[PDB]
Amino acid sequence: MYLRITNIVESSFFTKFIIYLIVLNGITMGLETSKTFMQSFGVYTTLFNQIVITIFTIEIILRIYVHRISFFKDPWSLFDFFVVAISLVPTSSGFEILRVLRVLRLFRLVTAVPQMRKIVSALISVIPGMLSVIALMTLFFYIFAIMATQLFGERFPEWFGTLGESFYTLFQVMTLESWSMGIVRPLMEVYPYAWVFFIPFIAVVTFVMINLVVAICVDAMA
Amino acid sequence: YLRITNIVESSFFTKFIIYLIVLNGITMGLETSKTFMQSFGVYTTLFNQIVITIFTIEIILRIYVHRISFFKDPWSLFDFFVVAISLVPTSSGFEILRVLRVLRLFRLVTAVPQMRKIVSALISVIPGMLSVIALMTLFFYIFAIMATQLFGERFPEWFGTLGESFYTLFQVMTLESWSMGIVRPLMEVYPYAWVFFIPFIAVVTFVMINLVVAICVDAMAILNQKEE
Amino acid sequence: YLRITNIVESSFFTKFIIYLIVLNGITMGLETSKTFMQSFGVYTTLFNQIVITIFTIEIILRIYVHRISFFKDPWSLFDFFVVAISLVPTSSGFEILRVLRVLRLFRLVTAVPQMRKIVSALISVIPGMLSVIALMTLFFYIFAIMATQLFGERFPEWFGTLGESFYTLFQVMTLESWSMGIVRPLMEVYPYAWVFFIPFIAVVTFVMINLVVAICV
Amino acid sequence: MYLRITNIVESSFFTKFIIYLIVLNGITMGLETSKTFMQSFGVYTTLFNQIVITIFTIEIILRIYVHRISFFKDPWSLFDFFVVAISLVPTSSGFEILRVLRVLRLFRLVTAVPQMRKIVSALISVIPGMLSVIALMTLFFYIFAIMATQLFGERFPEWFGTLGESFYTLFQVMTLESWSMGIVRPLMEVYPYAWVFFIPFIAVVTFVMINLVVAICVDAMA
């Protein structure tokens, strides 16, 4: 029987069936969006949900006993378990968030489907080349998120009144979203020297933000 | 068969079509003026039908000359569409179609070869990218849903529907007013809204960035492979 | 003839001009100060005319020394233009030419070699793009019209004119307030307005993407 | 004794120990932000700082004589020295600004740690290729900041009423933040041709700022 389950899991029909449950449940999860729906067919789908998660457990379990240790060294299956375990967390009570994170089980179409897996892994293999820069940037923010707070948090509490609020406000300034009209120009009505903080921050941040990309294109071309 | 062809294949023919386009092209940008469309309003409302009726004739003549080859040529199909588009009667129907006639000024992109190359050069990029647009389309969809069932209750205008979440997420992707316009107000009710939109902005920007780093490497691989 | 030529082509000539350039360059940024233009207002409107007075000789020296080479040289044609601009009388006429005088600080791009190349290095890039500036320009034109006759009725400042559409389309291209400022209000009247502006933004940027990759290549 | 002290500095324990205080002072700098803290163990921490900076000074002192003039031809140590010397400047009176500039000594976590230096020096090695264009950019701005002042400072003082404020507003337009809705559209209600000024500026400047990236990608690919 050891092998009876093996031929099930590795069969193309098995993969076909999982993907079918995905694309179907993918649709129907976006239908519990409609209020009209969750009245006419509302009872219908919370159960169909309970159905699909039940099958995936079997499938994810079938994958377990068939692959033994092969299952738990492959990110896609570890993700499958979590993204199933998430939806395995009870519907009732608990926290409302887990009632929502079930939708992550539609990234299982990135698992169950091979062509996406490559696009994904192609992008992630690129990540490590950046980590030397991402770290500095985080320190850089940290050294700046701190200064902003004790420079501007006094009269501008919402934006800089907290290291957390400064980190948010600094990220937004990095994104350049309303940084001047919304944040800096108001700031200067009180501290006319604010442009010495945020202009250098912006230049440094954008400059460094660029090199990261060339650092990527340089890697592949070299 | 050959009597019409030498007319059709003449350099004068290609020269002649382009003339009608820019003619209608200019004049379509002249039917814009209110001053214009009364004194010469009647004058010009005809010239359109003139240009397209000839275009129809042009579109009519061109078919039999190339036979099935006409409907295997992408460039001609748009001429056909935007001639067919412009052929549809003015009255009733939908107001939208009086405007899609103006697409027949992208028919100035068809008859000219120099345009054909630039365009397909841009489009030849699509298939290598298509794998990523798909992943992105999924990514949005999995998030447009969550926003709807997280924020649409108290923020209907932005997230009250999968459609409005899809919009609001696209706008956040473009980074236009994501924080001051959407997240900061969102955080006034869900002080944890930034845990949704900050990662999305990163992931989405992450992906968008790689798409170009996948293209520029694709081309600096032609010149690092011919170099052998 | 060569007596002036050996003067004109001398490095001291180049050095002295650049000195005059940087000099008048500074002084233009002081006609900005209100404090300045009263106490030292007389001082500088003349020094302006002074520096502009010298520049005529230099361009004339450059002319006869370079003969026709001067009027086939963009740098000399440009230098000449920005002197001719500054040659227009200070009083009356149009105030713009008293202001366009400041363009004579791009004459620091001529007399200085490193600038000449950086500028020309940037411009040699242009011809490969003109194929796209054209198609985009057409792309705008075919859309700016449609914007006018769809939204210009109820939204006049933004789309009420082919001209106002071009401006509003440039802004949407840059993505500045494109959604909050333009589309979301537009949608209050035409709930399908997003089918216009998303492809425009997509196509426009996708094109603006390719222009850059084409440059690194 | 000359060499007796020298072997201390390069010891595995020595380098490790400074980085220790850096992250320590690095951490502790981010707690003087919270008001809750500055009472129970706030006093605890006002003291802990003076310890760290005193050691940081000593550390910087040892490095000098051991390296002799070699300390003052090395940018990395001079920053440590400066960013510690900064922290040596008296607390009382003066300007509040210096209570904030202490935190830059957590960029001493970029010095005291070797692995960052390369990524950093890679970014700085990029700078010279831009200076040819960075200058022209600066040239371009100045010629325009003047025009804006003497075109728009009349009715729009906040934005262009001074060469300095025009320079500010021009950078803001360069970043494209609210350039149309925030500045140009209001400008056009009084100067309906203002768009002939800012569209080319935006075009050329963007024309240029992108060339900077080529100038980066080209030069760094050599």
Q: Among the three residues C96, C113, C130, which one is the final residue of a domain in this structure?
A: C113
Nearest to A201 by CA among A158, A114, A149, A141: A141
| C-alpha to C-alpha distance for A199 and D138, rounded to whole angstroms | 14
- When divided into structural domains, chain B yields a total of 2
> Which residues in chain B have their CB less than 8 angstroms from residue C216's CB?
216, 220
Q: Which residues of A75-184 form beta strands (DSSP E)? A: none
Q: Are residues A98 and A32 in the same domain?
A: yes
Alpha helices in C95-125 (DSSP H): 95-100, 107-110, 113-123
Do D106 and A143 count as a contact with CB atoms less than 8 A apart? yes
Q: Which among B142, B179, B210 is the nearest to A126, CB-wise?
A: B210
Q: Count the Cβ atoms, other than its own, within 10 Å of residue D129.
A: 18
Check whether A30 is labelled as a binding-site residue: yes
Buried residues in D27-48 as b, exposed as e (16+ CB within 10 A): ebbbbbbeeeeeeeeeeeeeee
Dihedral of CA atoms A50, A53, A55, A59 in degrees, nearest 10, equals -170
Report DSSP state, residue D183.
I
Q: Are residues B145 and B208 in the same domain?
A: yes
Q: Among the three residues B72, B97, B113, which one is the final residue of a domain in this structure?
A: B113
- Angle among Cα A114, A119, A124 to the nearest 5 degrees reads 120
Do C102 and D143 count as a contact with CB atoms less than 8 A apart? yes
Largest CA distance in chain D: 79
Interface test with B, best of A116, A138, A172 (most B CBs within 10 A): A172
Q: Are residues A146 and A89 in the same domain?
A: no
Q: Which among B108, B119, B176 is the nearest to C178, CB-wise?
A: B176
Interface test with C, best of D147, D174, D209 (most C CBs within 10 A): D147
- Give the position of tokens 């009349």: D154
Indicate the SS3 state at residue D30. coil
Reading the block at residue D99, the tokens are 């209570």
Give the domain range for residue C210.
Answer: 114-217
Report DSSP state, residue C155.
-
The residue in chain A having the minimum alpha-carbon distance to the alpha carbon of residue B220 is A221
- Whether the CB-CB separation of B24 and B104 falls below 8 Å is answered with yes
- Whether the CB-CB separation of B213 and A213 falls below 8 Å is answered with yes
| C-alpha to C-alpha distance for C201 and C208, rounded to whole angstroms | 10
Do C217 and B216 count as a contact with CB atoms less than 8 A apart? yes
- Give the position of tokens 């075009």: D203
Q: Give the number of C-alpha atoms closer than 13 A to the C-alpha of residue A81, restricted to the C-beta side.
A: 11
Q: Count the Cβ atoms, other than its own, within 10 Å of residue A52.
A: 21
Q: Give the number of C-alpha atoms closer than 13 A to the C-alpha of residue A126, restricted to the C-beta side.
A: 23
Q: Which among D175, D178, D213 is the nearest to A210, CB-wise?
A: D213
- Does the CB of C6 have a partner CB in chain D at under 8 Å? no
Do A133 and D119 count as a contact with CB atoms less than 8 A apart? yes
Indicate the SS3 state at residue A142. helix
Distances A186 to A10, A91, D163, D171, D173 between C-alpha atoms, Å: 62, 47, 20, 16, 17
Q: Are residues B12 and B28 in the same domain?
A: yes
Report DSSP state, residue C104.
G
Buried residues in B118-148 as b, exposed as e (16+ CB within 10 A): bbeebeebeeebebbeebbebbbbbbbbbbb
Is residue C213 packed enough to be buried (19+ CB in 10 Å), middle (13-18) or exposed (0-12)?
middle
| C-alpha to C-alpha distance for B201 and B219, rounded to whole angstroms | 28
Report DSSP state, residue D73.
G
Q: Are residues D98 and D139 in the same domain?
A: no
- Does the CB of D131 have a partner CB in chain C at under 8 Å? no
| C-alpha to C-alpha distance for A64 and A81, rounded to whole angstroms | 10
| C-alpha to C-alpha distance for D170 and A21, rounded to whole angstroms | 55
> Which residues in chain A have their CB less than 8 angstroms from residue D30's CB?
142, 146, 163
- Angle among Cα C23, D134, A219 to the nearest 5 degrees reads 165
- Does the CB of B137 have a partner CB in chain A at under 8 Å? no
Distances C150 to B81, B114, C155, C158 between C-alpha atoms, Å: 21, 31, 9, 11
Check whether B5 is labelled as a binding-site residue: no
Do C145 and B29 count as a contact with CB atoms less than 8 A apart? yes
- Whether the CB-CB separation of D190 and D155 falls below 8 Å is answered with yes
Q: Are residues B152 and B52 in the same domain?
A: no
Report DSSP state, residue C106.
S
Buried residues in B154-177 as b, exposed as e (16+ CB within 10 A): ebeebbbbbebbbbbbbbbbebbb
The residues, any chain, with a CB within 8 Å of residue D24's CB and separated by 6 or more, are D52
Per-window interface: C 188-217 vs B, CB < 8 A: 194, 198, 201, 206-207, 209-210, 212-213, 216-217
- Whether the CB-CB separation of B181 and B135 falls below 8 Å is answered with no
Question: How does DSSP assign A46-82, residue by residue?
Answer: HHHHHHHHHHHHHHHHHHHHHHGGGGGGSHHHHHHHH
Do C122 and D202 count as a contact with CB atoms less than 8 A apart? no
Q: Are residues A125 and A209 in the same domain?
A: yes
Do B131 and A115 count as a contact with CB atoms less than 8 A apart? yes
Q: Are residues C160 and C197 in the same domain?
A: yes
Q: Are residues D119 and D222 in the same domain?
A: yes
| C-alpha to C-alpha distance for C156 and B34, rounded to whole angstroms | 13
Q: Are residues B120 and B208 in the same domain?
A: yes
- Angle among Cα D62, D63, D67 to the nearest 5 degrees reads 120
Per-window interface: A 168-187 vs D, CB < 8 A: 176-181
| C-alpha to C-alpha distance for A55 and A60, rounded to whole angstroms | 8
Give the gap in angstroms from C-alpha D116 to the nearest C-alpha of chain C.
28
What does chain C come to in residues?
Answer: 217
- Whether the CB-CB separation of D18 and D99 falls below 8 Å is answered with no
Q: What helix, strand, coil percent values describe chain C, rounded to 5?
A: 80, 0, 20
Which helix (H) or strand (E) segment is C211 a member of? helix C194-216
The residues, any chain, with a CB within 8 Å of residue D160's CB and separated by 6 or more, are D148, D149, D151, D152, D153, D166, D169
| C-alpha to C-alpha distance for C71 and B50, rounded to whole angstroms | 48
Q: Are residues A10 and A78 in the same domain?
A: yes
Check whether A175 is labelled as a binding-site residue: yes
Check whether C211 is labelled as a binding-site residue: no
| C-alpha to C-alpha distance for A131 and B173, rounded to whole angstroms | 23
**Amino acid residing at C205:** T
Q: Are residues A99 and A181 in the same domain?
A: no
Check whether B227 is labelled as a binding-site residue: yes
- Does the CB of A103 have a partner CB in chain B at under 8 Å? yes
Dihedral of CA atoms A5, A8, A11, A15 in degrees, nearest 10, equals -120
| C-alpha to C-alpha distance for D145 and D170, rounded to whole angstroms | 7
Q: Among the three residues C56, C87, C113, which one is the final residue of a domain in this structure?
A: C113
- Give the position of tokens 């948090």: A153
Give the gap in angstroms from C-alpha A222 to the nearest C-alpha of chain B.
10
- Phi first, then psi: give them for residue D27, nearest 5 degrees: -55, -55
Distances A168 to B179, C86, D95 between C-alpha atoms, Å: 9, 50, 27
Reading the block at residue C215, the tokens are 């440059």
The 3-class secondary structure across chain B, one letter per residue, is: CHHHHHHHCCHHHHHHHHHHHHHHHHHHCCCCCCCHHHHCHHHHHHHHHHHHHHHHHHHHHHHHHHHHHHHHCHHHHHHHHHHHHHHCCCCCCCCCHHHHHHHHHCHHHHCCHHHHHHHHHHHCCHHHHHHHHHHHHHHHHHHHHHHHHHHCCCCHHHHCCHHHHHHHHHHHHCCCCHHHHHHHHHHCCCCCCHHHHHHHHHHHHHHHHHHHHHHHHHHCCCCCCCCC
Q: Which among B162, B201, B210 is the nearest to A33, CB-wise?
A: B162
